[PDB]
Amino acid sequence: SAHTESVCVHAGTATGADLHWLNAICTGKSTYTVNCAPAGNKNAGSTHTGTCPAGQDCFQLEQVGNFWGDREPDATCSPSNTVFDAVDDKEATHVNGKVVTRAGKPGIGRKLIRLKAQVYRRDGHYGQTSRMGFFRNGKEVYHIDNVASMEPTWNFDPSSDQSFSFFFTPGPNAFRIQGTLNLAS
């Protein structure tokens, strides 16, 4: 991404190196780690960190083609009011063994929506959780077991739906959850 490539370009100036991103991983709400390598030797990776600008969260991407043509995890930055995310840390919300994101409401009318979320490993790839789902109005209303992702639909109604949040069950293959609300049909 523009952001992860910039991390590599800035990392290479001190040695005149022509570095490009190999892959990149979200490590928190706004932080990410990039692995960089010289254009002439994809094998010579080095690790470097970045942080998304104010008002933006890290957004994990998958199967993004890098400079050498390999499809890899990548990271970009997205407005913090368009993405849900959480890792297992102290000021993550914990409920009944689950890590829960912030809760919020879209500003649309009565519409069918999709609640899309995935869990990710520490290496930035899709992972696996024993249980993941979403809360509505502060209560667990949907869950799905032993998966990397969820995408239930829902007839959103602003009069009855005050908030949604996503949750996952942390484990060796579930470090971060990332979710969005989207129009569906």
Binding site: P79, T82, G104, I113, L181, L183
Partner: peptide
């Protein structure tokens, strides 16, 4: 004759994430 070689894609942005108002 006049057939265009290649691929067109007219996709919209309606699938974009919705803006969220947090509680």
């Amino acid at each position: 004759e006049g057939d265009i070689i290649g691929t067109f894609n007219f996709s919209s942005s309606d699938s974009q994430p919705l803006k969220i108002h947090w509680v």
